[PDB]
Every structure is written in C-alpha cells, then in structure tokens.
Design a protein around this nucleic acid. Structure first.
Lengths: 154, 50, 98
DNA sequence: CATGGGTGCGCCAGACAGGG
DNA sequence: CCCTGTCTGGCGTCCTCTCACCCCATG
C-alpha cells in the first residue's frame, strides 16, 4: 500500500522537478516504491523507507518533505478534498453567462462602447436573436440592441 | 526613485512588504480552497517568518 | 442601419444637439447619413379657468413635441466609443438604437 | 516577461542548562 | 537548590573627497 506525501520544490521549476523525479525512479529502479507524481508543491504516491526518502531528497531542486518531523515525515490530511478540487478546477470556472433578460429583467453589457454597463431589457426578440436593453449613459437611458452573448443576464 | 539609467532602484522595505502581501494572498487563497493541514501550516509558517 | 433618435420638445434647443453629434462623429468615425427629421408634434388642450362656473373660459395651451433622427450609416467602433456617455443637449431623451 | 529564491575579533554580561 | 559551564547578543571615533556598480532568465 502506497500513501501520499508532499514535496517542496523551487517554485517555478516544478514540471522539471517532476520529470527529474520520474527519471531518478527509473534510474535507481525502485519501481515498486513509487506510484505517481501529481502537479510549488509536488504530490508523490510513495512508501516510506529511508532509501526512498534519500532518493526523493537527492532529486535536484527539491528542498524536502513537509510534515510533523524530519525523521518520519507525514502523509496527508484532506487529500480527498485536493483530488475533488483538481477534478473540477476548469469545469467549475467555466460559466459563460448569456443575456436571458426578458421584459424588465436587468442585463449586463461587456462588448462595444456599452461594455461595463448594466441596463434592463424592455423588449426581447428571440426570432431576431436581439435583446432591447438601454444603458444609463450620462443619465438618459440609451436603449440599444445587444446579442445574448454581447450581454450577460443580471 | 530611479537611478541615472532609468531602472528603479527599489528600497528593501518594498521587498519585505511585497513578500508579506504575496504570502498573505496565498494564505487567503489556500484557506478558501481548504488545503490540508501540512500545506496551511507551511503557509502560515512562511507568513510568520516573513 | 444604426439609429440615433432624439426626443424633446423645442426645435430651439435641439438645433445645437444635431450639430454636436454629427461633428463629434466626424472627428472619430466620419460615417453618417445626415439628420433626417420627423413631423412636429402638437398636444393642445383647452381647459376651464373659472373656479366654479361659466363654461366659456377655455384657454388653449400646448405641450409641443419634436423628434429628430441622426442615423449614422456604419456601426463604427469609434463614433459610439467617443459618444457613449456624452450628450450636450440637457433635459433630453436620447435613443441610441444600435 | 515577471517572479522567485564561510571557516583570522575580543571582552562583558546575563540567561540558560549542567552538574554538584 | 548552589555554584559552574555554555550559548547568544551587543558593541566598538568624527568630518570630507573621488571611484565602481547595483537579480538571473527564459519557456
């Protein structure tokens, strides 16, 4: 059974640390003592012998493990939470809000000179794919037609 | 203030404050993300030392 | 295809408003079909003035109305840009139908 | 382009262990 | 607990006049 551990690298050379770590594994052929390497912190599926500990700290541009002590360094705590966040990440970020504003509903403009402005859709045109919303420019409402993607639903 | 050439010769306190603010932003983001215990212990320890 | 309708009452204040928006568009976009007006609009109302009698005192007042349409020819990303939150005419209703 | 981590001084003095 | 050895800190003259040089590095 291989448990997880946290490695600190020089932040910025992290992919090169991961590649050099895989290569040191396949050099010193302790292939049965390493499972994966996940990407300033590098996650390593590993077991704990002092030989494998010296192996990971002899990988270049690696400071050391992060744990309770340096004798017996520490596996993890909320590893499941980290895995869940990694699975989402881009998926969670993706939103793409389009103007679903109907009669009276407020919308947001992010394209053309009217970008960075909000307003309400007094009239909507699904057939012409156009929303009739006015922007409060210099006080007076500026009824302009914007596409669903041109504006966001507020 | 810059020197003759134009590159800004920056003071040391700006390095210190900029380090503390970089680390504090990292620590707020990790407490947002619910990182595990050893990550936020190293993060708060680096803030303490900063 | 882009319409700039302007809606107010008098032609003696909108007359500087049709000058400010064709020339400031000329410096930035220089793409306009020229101001094409609309028929002047009249709202006349006869009203009784004596406080409790006498259905003869009817004085004619009117809230007059005027409309002028600018109609820039091309959707310019410079005319709208410079003239977005900008309108010289005060107490006016601008309708920048894009 | 922007960020990210040596080995030659000597005395005083008081606090911290370390016997005693 | 009463003395003894160690371990770290705190400190060491004042004015001036030039010079030289101030973060890589890189996918």
């Amino acid at each position: 059974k291989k448990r997880w551990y946290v490695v600190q690298a020089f932040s910025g050379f992290e992919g090169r640390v991961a590649t050099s770590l895989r290569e040191h594994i396949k050099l010193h052929n302790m292939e049965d003592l390493f499972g994966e390497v996940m990407v300033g912190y590098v996650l390593v599926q590993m077991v704990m012998n002092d030989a494998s500990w010296h192996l990971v700290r002899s990988v270049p541009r690696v400071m050391g493990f992060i744990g309770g002590t340096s004798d017996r360094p520490a596996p993890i705590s909320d590893k499941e939470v980290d895995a869940i966040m990694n699975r989402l990440q881009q998926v969670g970020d993706k939103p793409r809000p389009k103007t679903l504003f109907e009669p009276g509903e407020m919308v947001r403009v992010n394209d053309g000179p009217f970008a960075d402005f909000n307003g309400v859709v007094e009239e909507v045109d699904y057939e012409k794919s156009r929303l009739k919303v006015s922007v409060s420019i210099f006080g007076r409402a500026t009824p302009v037609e914007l596409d669903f993607s041109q504006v966001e639903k507020a | 203030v810059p020197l003759d050439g134009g590159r800004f010769a920056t003071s040391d306190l700006n390095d210190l404050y900029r380090r503390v603010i970089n680390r504090n932003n990292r620590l707020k983001r990790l407490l947002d993300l619910a990182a595990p215990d050893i990550i936020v212990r190293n993060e708060k320890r680096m803030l303490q030392e900063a | 295809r882009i319409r700039i309708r302007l809606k107010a009452f008098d032609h003696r204040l909108i007359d500087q408003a049709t000058a400010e928006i064709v020339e400031t568009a000329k410096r930035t976009g220089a793409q306009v079909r020229g101001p094409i007006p609309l028929p002047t609009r009249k709202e006349r109302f006869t009203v009784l003035i004596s406080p409790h009698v006498n259905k003869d005192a009817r004085d004619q007042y009117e809230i007059r109305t005027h409309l002028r349409l600018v109609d820039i020819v091309e959707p310019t990303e410079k005319t709208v840009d410079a003239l977005m939150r900008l309108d010289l005419a005060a107490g006016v209703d601008v309708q920048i139908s894009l």
